[PDB]
């Protein structure tokens, strides 16, 4: 009964309110063991679909479109992601100079020391896109390796269509069809799961708001507005603009990508929302050849919301220390935060961890007694900021897919 | 050459005798490194099939039957399992008061202390039925998560059959067919494996009897009879009765579920026997829609033999301590042992571990110096008792599937 | 553009030269972080294919040929592998007495002590060929377990073809076709990957030669010639001979198995080359029923090049110690080195580790201060020797497959 897009908004609005209230009275623990579980069941159900829906769609997608086309689509969507994320940091910086988060704040040092996670070599990360066992990739998460194999297999099935043989052309057809069976079936699942969305959505915000809502005060409130205001400007000033320029009606784009944006925001998992954001890509009629490759790739490479969040935070820490950053250091943030964004995982609260990487680049390590005491303040309202960070991450992926879809 | 059902009985009877004899002369180690290996090869071969045969059968099964039907089947078979297991504990208690195992026994304390394995929250166990990656489920055991996904995919394929599109209805057909190919192929395997059954069966009892046969004396003999007598009464007084009531000839039910019962008994793995017990379900002509869902689920939820074993043992320990249990404590065993049974894994010697959980509930922890010295006595003949525990576990799953099958 | 077989030879010859030169000037580290990566990308791409290409080909292969035929093929190819490997050790010994590697050498003791890796029981290794979860096998490497399941499934699909039912015979067809789709697609991939071969090949030798080329002097040179000369005699004196005897033109056999031999040599992974060596088996028109089963099995069981390498080395260590081995000890090497060869993994530098196993059997453990200081000399030029060891390993697998193919 009832529309689904309506039910979510109710769950979201009524959820955010049931949370803030329960938590203000200290029931933050009662909400965690009682309400949250439902929000988790929603997440689990979505993660469930990611592997099959991604793999099966791309084999059909890579088999669908031209091998050179897919290659062009790739060069375009990568150019887009880089230019978006780079603009998102600079949009965050301009929000961190506009507002002043942690301007006249002095913090209690020594409270908590943080541990630096040593990053692996770029080379190793790149060669690890090519998986040594496809079955293993699928078996345990691993979206990007799967992306690689799927496209390869996709293109392989195509070349088996042109073969002179009858028995080869038939077996290739059969494989493709069954794989497409899975694909089609997976999108049908996302509908039924989207039915439990309102209940899940209610719970998910009920938890976040009860756990970190009441901490959104003082300088922590100012940084929160700084991020959200910026994010808002990323949508209006970057998406709504690039969409108009390319001849896509921005308003009916928001209408079609509503379920994706809200799942993203609530769930906090850029990757966990992927089956919803992939459906929404089918909804506005984009070709499987394009969205099937862009959305899963961008789900990891493209994070505007995260890049921006890292911008405003690198400025929060700097202001809390009392020393300002140079004209050239702000430009050194832009370039590092992009790299950090790309790096950030499609999972909740993964941007905050990556934030450290962009903190060394300016000149304020995370081991520094006081820096670490300021970074703990941010970490305390991180799930509040994360919801924003994720929504903008996802929007950017649809936007990019759309723009690249229209040009072809 | 020769019939298979005949060969097993020979292997079983001649195996049990070759074992008892070899072991009485201290060759318990000679049997383990020489004879057992063959019994293991039989187990490995059966485990081999479980994943494919379960998954592929349920996708076809869930796709076969009505979504509401499958749902009704579920409510019925769950009601059945609970009422069986609850009756099985009370049947065990009445066997533990009838016989008195460890009545006037005083044990050498301090011999061995046992370590309590802290259980996870019920919530966590329930949300973990919904897998976050189907490929992962399959990849590493995980029967229940697979059950969930398979049904979901099954129902998804069905809704793709009714689609207006031609290319969708065809791809959905193709997937289903191939998946069914696997299913059909897996049952054919179980035949060939059942051919090695006699050799395996011979070895498997040869080991159990040589390793723990000679320990079946004294108070350990009395508890052994107590369990077996009870188990026997579970079959005659609960299955043979509930089968007559529902209009199923009990005798030709035992005739058809012979291979399942014997594999179960010998193997000691409720789960490892699953491909045999699934074939036997096909043998008596039950629909894939029903047995495909009941048998794998009940293979973990339903354990009458284990529930009973836990009943008679909670009384063995209590009598060895010298203090009797209250009228209300016996009722507190019924309710805990059911929960423990459900909990017990479809693997050999897993009931004994769970026994601890039902031991705390009455008031005699497993850390208590002497309790633990009595529980070590039971553990010493556990594989003897386990064979019984498993057979009755499995019978109950077929029985339930049968009864639910007849009503529809 | 350009032929592929020509490009490789250029990469190989020009690669070996760019390596030796760069390394002689100490750029061994510059080659490792700059050039090698490309050689790795080539390896990754090949490993990628192994699982799918092996599995899918054998299901179709086992389904293709007679169950008794496949069984005969097995007995023949096993007899062949054993007799080859046994002849390869004796051919190495005769090379180690012909040349005298480490005759008058006295080494600096105490430099490096090595750690013995305790081997598992033969029984455990044999029962572990039968996998307890096929999906797991595939999921993580595990070629032999996959081999077992694939054949079983293959034979199962066949028996489903003869069924009286229509819906069974169709579903069995569908499965087989799709699985064959994968198979066919995988061979098409190996072509495209073989296109990157020259670049990879260039880099791969560029690294090996820069890293261990300059160490190929003195007594280390003499043992190197001893191995290579022997290997050469294994090809001419064992393959070219057994091929003529069975009516196969040796020269156009080398022409067809060129890509396999060179990938093998460069890559150093007997297993990593398997998709190339499997294609080359298709190239000379052998049946999927035969090569699909022989090549992956022999890829682990059959290692002539490794067996020989172990022969000449067991003599190098013995001569460096100063005590000669008995007539009967040389015969005790033959029998142990075969077992060690079979044991050696289809991965780079795995023969050297196994060498230890055949070192205990004569009477000179690897823990012995000085033995271990001599074994470290060998380990230093091991990748040089490994390239030879691998090529001959692979050749032997094609040879055997060919000979068994002709007899049928
Ligand atoms: Na994203
Ligand atoms: Na990212
Ligand atoms: Na059971
Ligand atoms: Na259980
Ligand atoms: Na080999
Ligand atoms: Na080997």
Numbering used by the authors:
A (entry chain B), B (entry chain C), C (entry chain A): 9 to 416
What are the paper's exact sentences on this?
A prokaryotic cousin of the ASCTs and the EAATs, the aspartate transporter GltPh from an archaeon Pyrococcus horikoshii, was first crystallised in 2004, revealing the structure of the SLC1 transporter family. GltPh is a Na+-dependent transporter that is selective for aspartate. Like the EAATs and ASCTs, GltPh is also coupled to the co-transport of three Na+ ions and contains an uncoupled anion conductance. It exists as a homotrimer with each protomer containing 8 transmembrane domains (TM1-8) and 2 hairpin loops (HP1, 2).
To investigate the structural basis for the altered substrate selectivity profile of GltPh-R397C, we crystallised this single cysteine mutant transporter in the presence of L-serine, L-cysteine and benzylcysteine. In the L-cysteine-bound GltPh-R397C structure, the side chain of the cysteine at position 397 is pointing away from the substrate-binding site, which results in an increase in the size of the available pocket. Cysteine binds in a similar position to aspartate in wild-type GltPh and HP2 is closed, but the space in the binding site created by the removal of Arg397 appears to be occupied by an extra non-protein density. We ruled out possibility that bound L-cysteine forms a disulphide bond with Cys397 as the thiols appear to be too far from each other and because similar extra density is observed in crystals of L-serine bound GltPh-R397C. To investigate this, we examined L-[35S]cysteine uptake into liposomes containing GltPh-R397C and observe similar levels of uptake of L-cysteine in the presence and absence of the reducing agent dithiothreitol. In contrast, there are no observed clashes between cysteine and closed HP2, supporting the finding that cysteine is a substrate of GltPh-R397C as HP2 is required to close down over the binding site for translocation to occur. In GltPh-R397C, L-serine and L-cysteine binding is associated with an apparent number of coupled Na+ ions ~ 1.5–1.8, whereas binding of L-aspartate to the wild-type GltPh appears to be coupled to ~ 2.9 Na+ ions. The decreased number of coupled ions in GltPh-R397C is either due to the loss of a Na+-binding site or to the diminished cooperativity of binding. The latter possibility seems more likely because the geometry of all three Na+ sites is preserved, at least in cysteine-bound GltPh-R397C, and it is unlikely that some of these sites are unoccupied.
